[PDB]
Design a binder for this molecule. Structure first.
Ligand SMILES: CNC(=O)c1n[nH]c2ccc(I)cc12
Length: 164
């Protein structure tokens, strides 16, 4: 069913995450973590205090798809176990901020062809697939986008609901 999912998304905030490569999304799915640039880290930390749920919707650049979505379970923190993120070219991971803990809500993919009817008011009503890393997605568009994903029957949202 979709009822617990709708409860988790009620009055949520949504952010588009653009990963440079599939390796980083695979690490995030395995370890329940994400890290971003300080400009976006500050936005996500503000949002985490401001909303019942903050949802990250992931898309690997040039893949033509979203790879799933997850809910922040913490503000960013430093000093944890290192994560061997992959960065394009020889760019240094030192530019990243802290680490957010996340709980995956859906690990299934969704092709951009299926979200063509959704526009994001916070990005000039462009199709929701279009946006820089960290672009906020307005509530209604973000909710409908998450509801388009195939159900992920491996996930039990009972534990997530307890964290709200
Ligand atoms: C695991 N997160 C990243 O690798 C990442 N997040 N935002 C970015 C902006 C520029 C570059 I180069 C890399 C990133």
């Amino acid at each position: 069913g979709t009822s617990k999912l709708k409860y988790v998304l009620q009055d949520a905030r949504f952010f588009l995450i653009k990963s440079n490569n599939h390796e980083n999304v695979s690490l995030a799915k395995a370890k329940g973590v994400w890290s971003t640039l300080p400009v976006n880290e500050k936005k996500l930390n503000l949002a985490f205090r401001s909303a019942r749920s903050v949802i990250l919707i992931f898309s690997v650049r040039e893949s033509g798809k979203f790879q799933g979505f997850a809910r922040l379970s913490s503000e960013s923190h430093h000093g944890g176990s290192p994560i061997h993120w992959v960065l394009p070219a020889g760019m240094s991971a030192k530019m990243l901020g802290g680490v957010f803990k996340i709980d995956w809500i859906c690990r299934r993919e969704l092709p951009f062809t299926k979200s063509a009817h959704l526009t994001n008011p916070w990005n000039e009503h462009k199709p929701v697939k279009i946006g820089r890393d960290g672009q906020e997605i307005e509530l209604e568009c973000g909710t409908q986008l998450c509801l388009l994903f195939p159900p992920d029957e491996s996930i039990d949202l009972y534990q997530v609901i307890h964290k709200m």
